[PDB]
RNA sequence: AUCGAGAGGU
């Protein structure tokens, strides 16, 4: 009776998909809230960010399992912005996944040809 | 019941926790019923928070009539209580 | 909250226990109770002087008590009295009566 | 008195002893132990308890349905008239909303059965029974209540699902665990009671 | 008017106003109502 | 295994179960479980532990 | 008795 | 035996195990209750004079 | 009742193997061997064929008709 | 040539093939119906009325005698007669549906007779009766209807095959053993009591004036079965009296008679005779020394007549002549003293002998030579089953019916009206009495409800097949459930094999409510006459000729507590009796106990003795198989061969009975277990046998196995051996896997929780319109099973599922006994259930006018219509199957006419003539109308039952439990991607906290998980039977053979990060149970709503929108907090706030009119001085209740100093 | 007395589009609707519901008012 | 609705 509708895991209900705020407590630090997103995006995004030298801090948390969203705090060096490093990491991940895709498809075609 | 003089008062000069709870509740109840607020409001909407901020500035216009076991009593201002 | 009353609201500071005197019971009563019946021959109303005398209070949300004219939510219920044929012992007081 | 020793009981026509006045006044279920020193109370919920590691020590997680049922009678003043108007607009079925409006004369407007509930301007001195919302103060307890620490104050967090969720470290004062225990929640209905719960009874103060 | 099913036969019996509930091929005094005509929709989750 | 502060009582005549002889004060007869929960209780030990 | 019970069960329609 | 022997208010004592007997004794003696206890004020619905 | 369509844990479709499982059992195959021949490698997927009880068949015996 | 555990389970399988789990109920009821009813009828067969000739002065006065003889009873099969008068055979399912008692009518042959006194001048009682008129043949007369126990020999389902059970809508798994009363199933709970005809000596505790008491509860074998009880009290030493006096408390005597006086009343006047009766050894001086004081006390009476006068003066009647007193004393001494010994003339010698025996026993306990008796020894207690109880009830009801018939005779004779046999009997007596006792459980007459026993009949528990099996085998000890007497509650030593050690409820009824073990047999009783005849012919010396002095070393022989005589060679007698019973020449229920220290040979044949079967060890001196079981391997092979063979006659196969009749199995009760030596298993017998043959009995022992104590060298011969220890458990304790690896309260907790597990309770739940039913979608049989499950049929109708459980700390949402459930597993149907509820309604009627109609009520005519929806009702006032309802939606539309004379304020327009009495759905429930059954009731009025179904999916807050007392609620659900996984991708269904394991020491849970993993991998079923050689080491080797870590650990990866957890997880399948405790069934919130009419406080109950109790302890907690306003709000503003006006002069509530604002006190003539008091309504009610007792509680608002 | 209450309806637009139900209650703006599945209970704007007629047709809200007015 | 009985929960 008090169940939430499962579509609430995928529907924004008017919420913004991405929220970006500047962390005032720390310099060059920002908090990015992603709604209806979970560890799938957050884990890889934070790992890619930490592959970057301009990123001093990169962490994420899911405040409650009963809310589908996650917060990502990123702090960069003075010469760069958190938004730019986040975008660069996202673009790099997109490219990486693209090679994963292309090489998987090529190997699958080769293997199927071998089957025949 | 005889009122004790201000100089003769022997009870504690501090606000007791029960006195603090009663004072905050009474002032909040009076505020909720449109009692004039004796402190500047920064947009607070809860009467209890308004009463708390009045207390911090000792702006609650209330007394405590502490009764001694024999029936004599002492009136303490919420402002003068520590 | 309750319906308005002009009588001032006061705190009870004293519960004085006692025994109701026969004169107190007779005077404080609003209806003398004589008939064992509750309902009447007509049935549309209880027996006047039975055990549901309208002067004795209202338990029907419909009507208003004759004694006070108030609804069932404001009538506290009034007391009748039975005139016994001859006095009987109060079982609660039997030991005290014996001692006296 | 129908429990006289050495006398025959005044039986019922169904072969049962009559309920004498002494029996009405006597016992745990009598007036003075079942109706005066103890009572059934309004504005109280009860349900199973589960654990929430993400709750604050002083927070109680309350189901949405219970939050919709229980209400707090907040008085309308110049300081809350706008938010109270918004809550009245939301209605008894949308949380956070409101269920009743109490006028100056005492008449009780039911917002469900009032055809145009949302279009009622509020006037100072009225009251709005608004759904209990996040951060409200409630008494929370388990039975048996063996000591003071079995009734403590908590701040509400209205949240899905039907269990009362509470911090793990608060189980010990309640002697509670999540194998089936049920706990009770009482909603204070006045500013004085709220002040007392918040200033004396709250979990951190305990 | 109302059709019921003989709890033994399952046969359609058209009982009328104030008639003994009995089965006319099976004498059974227990019958069941028939599925409503309203729309019945269930989500498969 | 201790029942009312004492070893398993002689509920039969001078024995705890019909599986021992009369007047057996040995540890096994009176409710001493030398097994562990991992290893398992024998039926007599199971009954004595149930009594406790 | 078993045979009688069988007879009574099977013919409950006829014996009714 | 000990609690009800105490010279407390009638209502406070009748709230413990001897209700009708204690009330009958209080009535018989014409007893008077100060309403200074907790049980009495709670029964009468007044703010208890304690705490 | 009736064999579930998918496994509770693995989500593998088992509702199309109950008849095959029974037929394998009829051919002098142990339950383990039969489950192996059905390609049920995860013990979570195996438990549901192993421990299924077919109450549908018993519920079908109370047919109002013959 | 040694018996194996497989052979033991073949023997147990044969036992359960020939024995049903409801066998005790069924056999007790069969005994009552077949035999006991006829005996009850015979014991009051004749009714005689003597019409003497009143001296009216008219010639023709002749005395007459009228006689009615009750003959044989005939019980037909259950039938129903309808409103139209048609009579048909009734079937159990139709009875359940239409709310009919499933009872069979009973007829009795009555014959009438009229005789004329030969001469009317003869003194009363001496008239010679001449046969005047006699009925040529008897009249078969219907006297009542006896409820018939289901599946009993008189039920329509007896001897009926499975296919015909389906045709009747009956579950083949149902075992019967209950009654259908007004549609509801009722089971009779066995009632425990202390045995009759046994002498028990009890030491009274100081400072009681009595030191010891010997009590016998004497009962006639069949003559009302228990009337008289006697006591023999020894009085405590007093500083005034140097000796202790023995006084006999007898029925109908107001004082305790000194024992010597009652001896003299029996004719044993000389002191030497009395002390020969009591002190069988003249040389023993302590006994005689203790008897001397009572002789001193009783010298004033030296003759039988004076003793009888002394007894009579102390009778209940005072102011009577000496002759009548002496007659009364002799009548008491003959009839009301030890009636079980005898009640006929000339038997004072035997009663004196038994009284001396009782005194000797009591003084043996007073000399501290023997220990007092144990009131809780199980061999001294009897279980009354449905048979004996229904027998007592029927005896009472038949006596009442015969009293009615006699009153009819008297009334007809007085008015000279013709006497008709059919009109004489009020058949409603027996029918209504049996129906009422079985329906309410109040056991006895309707008019003695308080004095009657209660709870003898309980609604059968249809929550799970195992719960029903348990309920059919439940015993209740009627001890005070509030008095704290731990001894009756404790598990006694003698409970071994008779009662389940584990299954007992927690709480007040802990230890008092018990459950029979699997193989425990309760005796139904057999005649004692054949046994007495065999004793007499084999050399029993009667008690009349017995002289203790001549034979002091001879052994007393008892039968059913009656000292029949003395035997000189009791060993040979006992062997002969045991041999006869081992051939079934004697009934197998007969207890043959030879007490060697007490020189007794007690025989028992009565009903209520719990027995259990045991192997017999060959002990014959010349046998070649000393110390080996009588049952060979050949007999086991015969059991296997005859199990399948169906061409053989059903009654001539080799099965359980063939083992008992062949002398290979023996039933022993607790009394007889005291004289036998029982090996715990055939391997123990063998080990003892080599130990006794000189072999060292030594070998290399698997270190993982249980360690057994070395064979006792002090035991040279075993008399019996147990078939299997696992048989000491009950229905539910037999479902636990490895119960011997758990801490015992965990076994008890599982035995309690297995009743509440959701499963399929009966296969025919579809056609059953039960009030409540919970069904599991996809029940699975456990992977780890006990061999006892085959007989409990848990695999056929299981009540749980095998969930993949990981013991892990994952996110901390499974702490304090919570669990995390996979949400994907829930979505796929894990632990999903169906909830069925049924609402019953029917047409009422009074007089000749029907005042109820199933109709769709209309606003325009029906007054006081509910607020629910009437739009879902059909034209016949009902709701069709398949429709959707919620909350307060009306599912049955019913209206009742209003009298035309009623005028309700004009709200009842001229059109308004009826009132709505419809049936709304429960406010807290919603669902789909599953079914709507329509029929007619016994009275020919319309009768409807509406069954709703509602699917329940597991959610947060729902109770689940393992089979090891590990209960929890769901705290959180995670989806497939978010849960830890293995390298195969196995995701657990449930995650439980590690912290649940250590303190509780439920090692059986871990062993179960490992074994279930092994069985799921290999496909072989896992044997979790207790007391087997299945070790954790062997299971570990099996698990390692499948490529898994031997102890059940698995490397798991984190779902959130895919990282490999630092700790390895214990992951595997475990059998979990969905419990009937669902959070939505419990969630309740009240703001405001209904109040009680009298106190005006929130009503009780979730279902009725009631408030929660703010009790005494909560008030104390808020007092210690110091929150005065919190208490004022909770107890005044939120419960029963009320206002009154009090008079300031007299302090009494005044007459207040707030409309006119006028207040008055007529007593004081006060109209100006008043006060307004806010108080609870309960306080004003209390004050008015006091004023009703002339107590004036006066409220003064100003200090009247 | 609203004419919508008791009327079978399907959800037109929103995440719960396509679900059947019956209007238990109705405010001026939203209708409280009893869905046939999962014992669900919702509040849906009247404009978001197709209404089922006697002939099996689905009509819009404004069409429902135009039908209820009875003008013709 | 009331009363009584019983089964359960922590």
Numbering used by the authors:
A (entry chain K): 1 to 116
B (entry chain F): 61 to 142
C (entry chain A): 5 to 104
D (entry chain A): 311 to 516
E (entry chain L): 19 to 63
F (entry chain A): 774 to 825
G (entry chain X): 481 to 496
H (entry chain A): 1393 to 1443
Please give me the paper's original passages concerning this structure.
We show that the key transcription termination factor, RNA exonuclease Xrn2 engages with Pol II forming a stable complex. Xrn2 activity is stimulated by Spt5 to ensure efficient degradation of nascent RNA leading to Pol II dislodgement from DNA. Using fission yeast as a model system, we demonstrate the formation of a stable complex between Xrn2, Rai1 (DXO in humans), DSIF (Spt4/5) and Pol II. Our results support a model where Xrn2 first forms a stable complex with the elongating Pol II to achieve its full activity in degrading nascent RNA revising the current ‘torpedo’ model of termination, which posits that RNA degradation precedes Xrn2 engagement with Pol II.
Using Xrn2M to avoid RNA degradation, we reconstituted a complex of Xrn2, Rai1, DSIF, and Pol II with a DNA-RNA scaffold representing an in vitro transcription elongation bubble. Size exclusion chromatography confirmed that Xrn2/Rai1 stably associates with elongating Pol II-DSIF, forming a potential Pre-Termination Complex (PTC) (SDS-PAGE lanes 7–14). To gain a deeper understanding of the interactions within the PTC complex, it was subjected to glutaraldehyde crosslinking (lane 9) and cryo-electron microscopy (cryo-EM). We were able to obtain high-resolution 3D-reconstitutions of Pol II (at 2.67 Å) with nucleic acid scaffold and additional densities next to the RNA exit channel (corresponding to Kow5 of Spt5) and the region in the vicinity of Rpb2/Rpb10/Rpc10. In these reconstructions density corresponding to Rpb4/7 is missing. We suggest that Xrn2 uses a small α-helical region embedded in the mostly unstructured segment to anchor the enzyme to Pol II. These interactions are mostly ionic with arginines (R492 and R496) of Xrn2 interacting with a negatively charged pocket formed by Rpb2/Rpc10. In addition, isoleucine 489, located in the middle part of the Xrn2 peptide contacts a hydrophobic/negatively charged stretch of Rpb2. A cluster of crosslinks is observed in the middle region of Xrn2 contacting Pol II (Rpb2, Rpb3 and Rpc10) as well as Kow5 and CTR of Spt5. The region of Xrn2 engaged in interactions with Pol II is located between two parts of the enzyme that constitute its single catalytic domain.
